[PDB]
Amino acid sequence: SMQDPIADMLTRIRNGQAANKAAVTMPSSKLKVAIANVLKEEGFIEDFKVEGDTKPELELTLKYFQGKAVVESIQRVSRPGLRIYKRKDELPKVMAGLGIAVVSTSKGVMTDRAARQAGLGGEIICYVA
Amino acid sequence: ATVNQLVRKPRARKVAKSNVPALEACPQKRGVCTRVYTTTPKKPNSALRKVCRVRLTNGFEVTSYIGGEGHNLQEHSVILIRGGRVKDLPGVRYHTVRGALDCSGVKDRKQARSKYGVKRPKA
RNA sequence: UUAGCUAGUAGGUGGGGUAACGGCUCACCUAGGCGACGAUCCCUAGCUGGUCUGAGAGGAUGACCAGCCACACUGGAACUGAGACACGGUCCAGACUCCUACGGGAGGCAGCAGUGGGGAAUAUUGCACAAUGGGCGCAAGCCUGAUGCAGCCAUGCCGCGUGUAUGAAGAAGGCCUUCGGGUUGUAAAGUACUUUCAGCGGGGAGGAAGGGAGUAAAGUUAAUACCUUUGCUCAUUGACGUUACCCGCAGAAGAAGCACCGGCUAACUCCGUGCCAGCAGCCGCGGUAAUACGGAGGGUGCAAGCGUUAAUCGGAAUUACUGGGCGUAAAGCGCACGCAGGCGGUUUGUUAAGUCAGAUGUGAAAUCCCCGGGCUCAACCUGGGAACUGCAUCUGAUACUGGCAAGCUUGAGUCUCGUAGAGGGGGGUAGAAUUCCAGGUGUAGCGGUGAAAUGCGUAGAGAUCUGGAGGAAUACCGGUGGCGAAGGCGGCCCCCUGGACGAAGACUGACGCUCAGGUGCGAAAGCGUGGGGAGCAAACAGGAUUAGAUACCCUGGUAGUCCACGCCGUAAACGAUGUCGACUUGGAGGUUGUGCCCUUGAGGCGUGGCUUCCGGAGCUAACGCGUUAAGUCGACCGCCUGGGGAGUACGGCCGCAAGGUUAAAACUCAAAUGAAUUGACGGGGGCCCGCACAAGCGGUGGAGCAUGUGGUUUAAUUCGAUGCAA
RNA sequence: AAUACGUUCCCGGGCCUUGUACACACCGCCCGUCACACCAUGGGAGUGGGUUGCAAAAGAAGUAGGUAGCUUAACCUUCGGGAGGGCGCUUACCACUUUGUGAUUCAUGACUGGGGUGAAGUCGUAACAAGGUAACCGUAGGGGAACCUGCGGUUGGAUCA
RNA sequence: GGGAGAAGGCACGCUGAUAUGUAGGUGAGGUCCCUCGCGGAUGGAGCUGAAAUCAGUCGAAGAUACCAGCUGGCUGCAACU
Ligand SMILES: [Mg+2]
Ligand SMILES: [Mg+2]
Ligand SMILES: [Mg+2]
Ligand SMILES: [Mg+2]
Ligand SMILES: [Mg+2]
Ligand SMILES: [Mg+2]
Ligand SMILES: [Mg+2]
Ligand SMILES: [Mg+2]
Ligand SMILES: [Mg+2]
Ligand SMILES: [Mg+2]
Ligand SMILES: [Mg+2]
Ligand SMILES: [Mg+2]
Ligand SMILES: [Mg+2]
Ligand SMILES: [Mg+2]
Ligand SMILES: [Mg+2]
Ligand SMILES: [Mg+2]
Ligand SMILES: [Mg+2]
Ligand SMILES: [Mg+2]
Ligand SMILES: [Mg+2]
Ligand SMILES: [Mg+2]
Ligand SMILES: [Mg+2]
Ligand SMILES: [Mg+2]
Ligand SMILES: [Mg+2]
Ligand SMILES: [Mg+2]
Ligand SMILES: [Mg+2]
Ligand SMILES: [Mg+2]
Ligand SMILES: [Mg+2]
Ligand SMILES: [Mg+2]
Ligand SMILES: [Mg+2]
Ligand SMILES: [Mg+2]
Ligand SMILES: [Mg+2]
Ligand SMILES: [Mg+2]
Ligand SMILES: [Mg+2]
Ligand SMILES: [Mg+2]
Ligand SMILES: [Mg+2]
Ligand SMILES: [Mg+2]
Ligand SMILES: [Mg+2]
Ligand SMILES: [Mg+2]
Ligand SMILES: [Mg+2]
Ligand SMILES: [Mg+2]
Ligand SMILES: [Mg+2]
Ligand SMILES: [Mg+2]
Ligand SMILES: [Mg+2]
Ligand SMILES: [Mg+2]
Ligand SMILES: [Mg+2]
Ligand SMILES: [Mg+2]
Ligand SMILES: [Mg+2]
Ligand SMILES: [Mg+2]
Ligand SMILES: [Mg+2]
Incomplete structure (x- = not known):
């Protein structure tokens, strides 16, 4: 389903x-x-x-x-079968920063870059480049 | 494949099966010579290869190669064996250590002497 | 290949008990407690800091140092004590050993040495309490196999030496050589020169702080005693020790071996051997030139070591969390239903477990890492840091996941009316044919094969016509047609019944997807009982073929194939492709719904379900797949981890049996395997040529002789040519 | 001189195509019994050890409970003895041990089964080509062996003229 | 179905308490109804009475005598009564 x-x-x-x-x-x-x-x-x-x-x-x-x-690429990271959470100091970056990771935080959905700068971690929804 | 599946049944590495079990993780073993004979090898080779059957101090009884040209070994000879198969001799998985215990060195060797238990010739 | 475990058991009351809470114990009462989030049972094992490996994630591991635990010959016990159920204490029992004057006694190295034994293998029955530390003592001191040291072993790590420089037609010798020369080789000899280390003499730090006599001052006190603290002087304390280190003497003097040189892999030649003797990590070397065997010369790599064996991790993305696979290579359970479990559409509020943030505590030291310091350097020692990626508490954040509450309608169901269908079960019934029975006509064969024979026919077959019995299957329709989860389902009619699809709108309101275990279904053959029995046909018999022919062919023919009721549970049970959902260009058809159009033609324009053949991107080792995916994604399950051994053995469950299911290991090999390529080959195919056949004329095979060969003979009948190509 | 319509058939060959498990390339590859040698393993009347369940039996020392007998310096005494202790006895727990019967695991066993490995051996030729009867899967029966035969299934079958 | 009484174990007398005789069995007077009897209900007196637990006690011995299975393992034959 x-x-x-x-x-x-x-x-x-x-x-x-x-x-x-x-x-x-x-x-x-x-x-x-x-x-x-x-x-x-x-x-x-x-x-x-x-x-x-x-x-x-x-x-x-x-x-x-x-x-x-x-x-160029768009992939699911965390998923119903395997939730992925990261801390602020563990936030991945895609293509050495050229792409982005979409992160869901206590302050809503934003990029790895944003969450990083705002001292947050969250569920890693996807990568995009 | 599934994460769920691995969570129920973890990856399980295969345990390596040994090629020299009679040694029981010892570098050599001692043993008495049960039979001392020759045997012919496998395709495509042809010879009369010197082997011996040896009952080891731990009970195992194995066939072992007697390398080098010439040997003075017989039944009740006490020898030292080491790992090392003989490829064209199936079943043969150990080598006899020339120049240890009752096993003499190879006669008249000059090159690779230490692999055949031969003292350095005065010269 | 262990699924159930539990009577002090789980709890309650009260008494007792401990240093203390407690089924710790006892009585009574309740009937609980544990378990698929793995109890119980079985196997194995001291745990950690860390160690080795790896970029990491991991993998492997728990000597030496440090922390915790447990043990002290084996089993049990308590006594003393702050502490023990006591490592050199006690008691009992056991195993064992020693002493004895025979009556009786004694002991426990897993402390340090040492011995026997086992083993491939692991050290001296040493010196000293000088230093640090422990016990006792006011002290002096005594004790300390802790410890500091020394001995043994290349076991490892690190350092240094075994000389430095000069030395040519470049000697002799060796080795290769086409005899020109090349090489060993500045190597050696010669010439100077150095003297580390080892040898021998000479000198000489530090590890030493203290403690002892006196003295002086303070605190004490009646007191200058004593005591204690702190200064002063005097004489003293080192097992190591022949210390470290420094100076002197003699002379290159005392100090180089091991493996390798076919590819992987740095290093090539000769001689010997000849599928032997032998090598071999993997491939693979060896039958007359062997860089692969063995010796030599030469060379390469290491060097007080070098090799071989053993062993962990690596490379191995080869258990794949990071980081793989299942159409044809190992791998989709034969199919479906479904509990547990995993996952779950969309909105609001709430919660704040997951998740995220911050703060605080903790994460022993050593180790690792960074920058420094000390031994002549290095190993080694050491200061400080960083790191310990972890855990816990508190306080917050609320997007996502989880809980809770209300919903929502698109997922999923229900309702209505229709459609197509070999979907299932039961009961009837039909016409063709075979075989058989009964007759008419007819007369010598029929039947079968490659050819035959067995077989059948004058008791009249076969052939023909007629009537009847019986069983089994349903031509044409019929079709990459249809239906079903799969297996599988086909004449016609009725009855009972399952599923699928379409149209329209109403209803329920996430009721969903997947599914280990469980349950059900499941071709053929096979099994049990009783029926049935035309045709076919395992077995079996007979006839043939053949060198044989337990076969293929023929004549017969039993089980079986058919029915009922049970069993079995397997197939290349296949799309060799698990189920569900979402998304991604096209062309031609088949099948089956349904809306529209002068129905005005057997049509024209749409819109669902299933299906066949091509093909696009993409995917794929290729073959191929390609909206019915093998593409792009997600949820859940099953399965694979080199070939053989083996879907075997053992155990369990199942079966009347045959057997099924679950499912190993030893051993053995360096392969096994998939797709595609170039050949060759086929008792495969197509097209085409040649005196190849066909059309012709004349021959050879018979005869006599010539001649060659074989054979036979011989003292010798010389050697060679042997399918077409002697 | 004769005769040739023609290429179906024999033999050799050429090109295209197809199947292949062949590549010292069909004088190829390869299968099983049988014979011999070696290896490991299963079964096997049994033999010998380890561990263990259940049912009972046993009861050293110790500690605790009970205590008539015996015994007793410290305290009490009205001097007779008391209280209290010790010993002995006794009960509870429990080690060794014993008996019966099961379970499990290791080793071993006359003999027997299949399996693997060997330069060459014997019998055939089962598969690979349409492999000369297409092969294979399941099943059943038969046969020195590879196999043959029946039934159903699959194409992972050549040729379709 | 069996094998099975497999094998093997424990208890066993007497006295008292629970209970001066218990669980149970039997059942009268009385009361009441009655389609009145050889009736029904109620009632529980009297009678009778195993077994258990606890405590005690005698003997060498409690199924004390008579009475009353011995048990187990391998194998031939015939199924069995
Ligand atoms: Mg209490
Ligand atoms: Mg252990
Ligand atoms: Mg030690
Ligand atoms: Mg030690
Ligand atoms: Mg330690
Ligand atoms: Mg003890
Ligand atoms: Mg005490
Ligand atoms: Mg202790
Ligand atoms: Mg001792
Ligand atoms: Mg020894
Ligand atoms: Mg020369
Ligand atoms: Mg010196
Ligand atoms: Mg000093
Ligand atoms: Mg090279
Ligand atoms: Mg070599
Ligand atoms: Mg040579
Ligand atoms: Mg290794
Ligand atoms: Mg790995
Ligand atoms: Mg793979
Ligand atoms: Mg295919
Ligand atoms: Mg496969
Ligand atoms: Mg399938
Ligand atoms: Mg709020
Ligand atoms: Mg320094
Ligand atoms: Mg440091
Ligand atoms: Mg520090
Ligand atoms: Mg630390
Ligand atoms: Mg929520
Ligand atoms: Mg008929
Ligand atoms: Mg509603
Ligand atoms: Mg039948
Ligand atoms: Mg026949
Ligand atoms: Mg039968
Ligand atoms: Mg199967
Ligand atoms: Mg296609
Ligand atoms: Mg393409
Ligand atoms: Mg394997
Ligand atoms: Mg089986
Ligand atoms: Mg192929
Ligand atoms: Mg002709
Ligand atoms: Mg002639
Ligand atoms: Mg031809
Ligand atoms: Mg056995
Ligand atoms: Mg054949
Ligand atoms: Mg064939
Ligand atoms: Mg068939
Ligand atoms: Mg009693
Ligand atoms: Mg007999
Ligand atoms: Mg009888």
Whole structure:
């Protein structure tokens, strides 16, 4: 069944991106919306919207550069079968800092960089480069 | 594969099975010569290889090679054996230590003497 | 290949008990307590700091130093004491040994030496309490196999030496050589020169602080006694010890071996040997040139060591947490249901266990690491730091996970009406054919094979027509058609019944996915009882083939194949591809729903389910897979860890049996394996050539002789040529 | 001189293609019984040890409880003895030990089974090509051996003219 | 089904207490109903009475006599009565 909708989100991005799709859409959720926010703010997607009230559909506008996908890799780290948590001084960095790790903290979802600078650790949701 | 699965049944390294069990993790063992004979080897080789059956101080009885050209060994010879198989002689997994106990050195050796129990010739 | 364990057992009351809480103990009462988060039982084992290895994560490990525990010949016991159920105490019992005048006694090295024994293997029955530390004493001191030292062993680590410089046609000798020369080789001899270390003489730190006599001052006190503290002087204390270290003497004098040189791998030649003798970590060397055996010369690598063996980790991503796999290589359980378990859509509030932050305590010292210091350097010793990535308490943060509460409708169900189907079970029934029975016609064969024979027929077969019995299976339809979880399901009709799919809207409100153990299903053969028995056919008999022919072929033919009720539980049970869900370009078909369109044609435009063939990206060792994934992801399960041994043995469970299920080890090899490539080959195929066949003419094989060969003979019948190609 | 339509058939060969477990390449590879030697292992009337459950029997020393007999310097005494102690006896616990019957594990055992390994041996030729009867899987029966045969299943079968 | 009474173990007399005789068995007077009897209910008197635990006690010995299985292991044969 559909027991990890975040992996599903990652994957819908990854596959539509690989399929040079202009956009991708998925059932929404606050947690997805919090991740989409980080992606956009770090320039991995154009923009996003959620539409509807009772059955909210979230939509991500993908991004391309040299007839290439801006998103090179996008992988699930922590997951329902194996939760991954890190401390502030243990926070991974992707591509030596060129990519990012999405981290969920007591102060909401942010990048490894952000959480690092704010003295926090959290659940490592994914890597993106 | 699953994490869950490993959590129920951990990775379990295979225990190495030895090639010289009769030694029981000793560098050599002592033993009496039970039979002293020759035997022919395996494809593609051909010879009369000197071997002996040896009852060791720990009860094990094994066949052991008697390397070098010439040896003066017989039944009731007390010898020292070490690890080391003879490849074209299946079953043979030990070597006799030339020039220890009742086993004499190889006669007239000049090169590699210490592997054949031969004193340095006055010269 | 251990699933159940437990009567002081778990708790309660009260008495007793301990230094103290306590089933510690006893009485009474309750009937609990433990266990798949692994109890019980079985095997093994002292735990740690740390050690070795590894980039790390890990793996392996627990000598030496330090911390804790346990033991003191074996089993049991308490006595004394602050402390013991006592390492050189006591008592009892056991095992064993020693003394004895025979009546009786005595002892316990796992303290330090030492002995026997075992072993591949591990040291002296040494000196001293001078130093540090322990016991006693006011002290002096006495005791201290703790300790400090010395002896033994290359066991390891570190340091140094075994000389330095000069020395050429470059000698002699050796070795190779095409006899020109090359090499050993500045190596040696010669020439100067140095003297560490070992030898011998001479001198001489430090480890020494104290303690002892006196003296003086203070605190004491009646007191200058004594006592004690602190200054002063005098004479003294070192086992090591022939110390470290320094100076002098003699002379290169006393000090170099081990393995290797085929590839991996630094180092090549000759002679000897000849599948022998032998080498060998792996491949693999050895039958006349062996850089691989053995010797030599030469060379390479190490060096007071060098090799071999043993042993841990590494390389090994080869148990893969970091960090792998299961279509064809090892690996998807034959299939489904499902408890425990793992995981779980979306919103709000709450909680604050997980997670995160901070603070505090702790994480012994030594070790490791960093910067310094001390021994002539180094090993070694040592100061300070950093590190101990861990644990615990408190206080916070609330995004994610968990708990709690209310929900939500998209997941999942329920409802209605229809559709297709060899889905299952039971009961009827049909026409074709075989075999058989009964007759008519007919007459000499039928049958079978490559050829035959066995077999059948004048008791009239076979052939033909007619009537009847019986069993088994259902041509055509029929199809990369359909249905089912898999196994598997096919004439027609009815009855009972499961699943799938479509349309529309209503209802329930995460009720879901997966599933170790458990349960059920599960081709054929096989088993048990009773039926049934046409055809087919293990076994068996007969006929053939063949060198043989326990076969393939023929003539027969029993079990079985069929029915009922039980058993068995396996197959290449296969897509050799586990289940569920989400996502990712296309083309042509098959099948089956359904909405729309002058139905105006056997159509035109959509929209679901299943399915076949291609193919795109991507994936893959390749082959291939490719929206029915072997692509991109997630949840859960099963399984693999080189070949043989072995799906074997032993144990357990199961079965009437056959057997099934779970599932090892020794031993042995350096392979086994997958896909694809170039050949060759095939009693595979296609196309095509040659006096290859076919069409012709003349021959050889018979005869006599010539001739060659074989054979036979011989003193010799000389040697060679032997399928086409003698 | 005769005769040739033609390439189905024999023999040698060429090209394309296919299957292969062949590569000193079909005079290839390879399978099992049987014979001989060696290795480890299972079974096996049994033989000998270790550990252990249950049921009982046993009861040294010690400590505690009880205490009539015996005995007693310190305290009490009205001088007769008292209190208290010791010994002895006795009860509880319990070591050694004994008996019966089970369980488990190690070693070993006449003989027997299969397995592995050997330069060459004997019999055949089962698989690899359509391997000359396509092979294999499960099962059952048969046979010196590889195997053969029946039933169902699979393609991991050549050729389809 | 069996093997099985496998094998092997423990208890066993007497006296007292629990209880001057218990659990149980039997059942009268009385009371009440009655379709009245050889009736039903209630009631528990009297009678009878094993067994257990605790404590004590005699003997060498408590199933004391008579009475009343010996047990186990391997193997031939016939299934069995
Ligand atoms: Mg109490
Ligand atoms: Mg031990
Ligand atoms: Mg020591
Ligand atoms: Mg020591
Ligand atoms: Mg220690
Ligand atoms: Mg003791
Ligand atoms: Mg005491
Ligand atoms: Mg102790
Ligand atoms: Mg002692
Ligand atoms: Mg010895
Ligand atoms: Mg010369
Ligand atoms: Mg000197
Ligand atoms: Mg001094
Ligand atoms: Mg080289
Ligand atoms: Mg060598
Ligand atoms: Mg040679
Ligand atoms: Mg090693
Ligand atoms: Mg590893
Ligand atoms: Mg792998
Ligand atoms: Mg295939
Ligand atoms: Mg496979
Ligand atoms: Mg399957
Ligand atoms: Mg709040
Ligand atoms: Mg220094
Ligand atoms: Mg230090
Ligand atoms: Mg420090
Ligand atoms: Mg420390
Ligand atoms: Mg929540
Ligand atoms: Mg008929
Ligand atoms: Mg509602
Ligand atoms: Mg039957
Ligand atoms: Mg037949
Ligand atoms: Mg039968
Ligand atoms: Mg199977
Ligand atoms: Mg395809
Ligand atoms: Mg492709
Ligand atoms: Mg193996
Ligand atoms: Mg089996
Ligand atoms: Mg192939
Ligand atoms: Mg012709
Ligand atoms: Mg002729
Ligand atoms: Mg041809
Ligand atoms: Mg045995
Ligand atoms: Mg054949
Ligand atoms: Mg064949
Ligand atoms: Mg068949
Ligand atoms: Mg009594
Ligand atoms: Mg007899
Ligand atoms: Mg009889």
